């Protein structure tokens, strides 16, 4: 079913993501214990003899270079390389009545692993990762033996070498294995299943799919819909099918489909008398906006006022990438209820409200805040003589500034609640503006 929010990430986010799984990993390559080598020889130099490598464990691991791309159809593909690891042991030569002592390290370079990512979705709607078909190489071999003992390293080149290589990619790859499942999967679980977004209404975040992984990009769709707190009635669904085009700049782009507060924005409203408060001076009676028109109280004296007015356009356009530029535009008129119990209409106006949001991330929520301008009334009809607009005007911002501006700017204060794993926080939001959908855009940074 078609998703509220999506989230895409892109090829640069794929790469965060490697660089900074590659970190989790060479830790944990540490915990790789190598078995312990064991036998006899016949070096011609010397005789036959038992020798033994005995008490290997890792000690220098760097895994730098990697690269995450897209399997598309099943998930990703991981090749970290350059890597080096660095192998540390004790030996033991029994040659005569005697046993000798001694330690070696080894220097392994030019390392490369190759590993299937493979995202898929479990019933109740969480990530769930495996990694198949793991390949390692595990090549360019430094030894160093204690004591300057040559037949040593010859023995080493011709019976342990190989062995040890295959040994080690081996052991590698199953910890990458391992890791996947035990680590990384419980981690993309981090990801809310529900994210509550006010004490009233609430989110569900379970997957409607498996993450998509595309040619160029990776869509993790989720349900992403408003939820009753209470008792979850399902009155909201029926979220489209949403598409915005190639947006490579950033690491992950939402889609937001829709919300609740004002997220429209052919938005109509009333006001009447008695939705104004009774400590804030401004009523709806004609004796009131006696000032504004002289003549209302004389065809209508000590009467209720209603206001019927509608939005006609939201022109937004974008000043930093963060912050809109928003006026919407309305046009109200006034009627005033007379005895008759039928409104009959008096004035018109033309308003236009010069606002700025600007927005951030703020603890896995996108936050705004509202940023009060101008607000512009001109007459537009007026069957009861000259409106004073410049008066008005006045009220229409006292109004503003303490009704519907403090409200919108608590409303964007609350914020919205995304869709991310532990750890994470997201930095340089473009707020691009869509069809259905909100766009944002955000770099992504692992809260080590
Ligand atoms: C899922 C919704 C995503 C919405 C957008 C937000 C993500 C934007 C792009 C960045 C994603 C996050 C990157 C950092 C996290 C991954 C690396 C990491 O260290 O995680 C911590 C985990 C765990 O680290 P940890 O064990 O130190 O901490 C776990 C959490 N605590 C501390 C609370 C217990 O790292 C691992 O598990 C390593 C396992 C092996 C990794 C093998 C290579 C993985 C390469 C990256 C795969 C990315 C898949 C993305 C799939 C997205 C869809 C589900
Ligand atoms: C599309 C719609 O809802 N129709 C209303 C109409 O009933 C109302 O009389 C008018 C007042 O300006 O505003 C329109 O938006
Ligand atoms: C659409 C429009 O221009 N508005 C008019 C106006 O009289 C008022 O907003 C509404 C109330 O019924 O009626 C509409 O016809
Ligand atoms: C926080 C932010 O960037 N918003 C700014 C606002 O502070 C500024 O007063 C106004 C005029 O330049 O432009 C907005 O975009
Ligand atoms: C990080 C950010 O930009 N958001 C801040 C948040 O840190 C702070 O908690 C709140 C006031 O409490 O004000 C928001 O604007």
């Known amino acids: 079913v078609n998703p509220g929010v999506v989230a895409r990430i892109t090829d640069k986010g794929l790469a965060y993501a490697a660089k900074e799984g590659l970190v989790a990993l060479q830790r944990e390559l540490y915990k790789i214990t190598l078995p312990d080598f064991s036998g006899d020889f016949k070096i011609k130099a010397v005789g036959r003899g038992q020798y033994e490598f005995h008490s290997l464990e890792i000690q220098n691991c760097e895994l730098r270079g990697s690269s995450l791309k897209l399997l598309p159809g099943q998930g990703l593909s991981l090749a970290i390389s350059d890597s080096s690891i660095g192998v540390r042991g004790k030996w033991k030569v029994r040659k005569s009545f005697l046993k000798l002592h001694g330690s070696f390290d080894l220097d392994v370079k030019g390392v490369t692993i190759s590993v299937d990512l493979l995202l898929g979705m479990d019933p109740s709607g969480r990530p769930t990762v495996s990694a198949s078909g793991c390949s390692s190489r595990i090549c360019d071999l430094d030894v160093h033996i204690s004591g300057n003992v040559g037949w040593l390293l010859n023995l080493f080149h011709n019976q342990i070498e190989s062995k040890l290589q295959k040994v080690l990619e081996n052991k590698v790859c199953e910890m990458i294995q391992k890791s996947v499942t035990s680590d990384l999967q419980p981690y993309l679980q981090t990801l809310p299943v529900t994210a509550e977004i006010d004490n009233v209404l609430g989110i569900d975040y379970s997957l409607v799919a498996a ?212 750890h994470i926080q997201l930095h340089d939001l473009d707020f691009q503006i869509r069809k259905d959908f909100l766009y944002l855009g955000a770099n992504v940074q692992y809260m080590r």
Do not use: C
């Open 211 to 422: 993450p998509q992984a595309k040619a160029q990009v990776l869509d993790v769709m989720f349900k992403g819909e408003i939820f009753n707190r209470n008792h979850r009635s399902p009155v909201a669904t029926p979220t489209p099918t949403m598409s915005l085009p190639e947006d490579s700049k950033q690491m992950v782009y939402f889609a937001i489909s829709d919300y609740a507060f004002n997220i429209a924005s052919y938005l109509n409203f009333s006001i009447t008398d008695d939705m104004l408060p009774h400590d804030s001076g401004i009523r709806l009676n004609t004796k009131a906006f006696r000032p504004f028109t002289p003549q209302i109280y004389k065809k209508y004296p000590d009467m209720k006022l209603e206001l019927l007015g509608t939005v006609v356009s939201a022109p937004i356009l974008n000043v930093s990438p963060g912050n809109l530029s928003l006026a919407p535009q309305m046009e109200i008129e006034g009627f005033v209820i007379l005895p008759t119990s039928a409104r009959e209409p008096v004035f018109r106006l033309g308003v236009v409200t010069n606002v700025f949001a600007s927005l951030t991330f703020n603890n896995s929520k996108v936050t705004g805040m509202l940023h009060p301008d101008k607000a512009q009334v001109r007459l537009i009809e007026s069957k009861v003589g000259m409106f004073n607009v410049n008066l008005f005007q006045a009220f229409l911002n006292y109004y503003l500034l303490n009704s519907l501006y403090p409200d919108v700017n608590a409303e964007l204060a609350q914020g919205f609640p995304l869709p991310l794993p532990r």
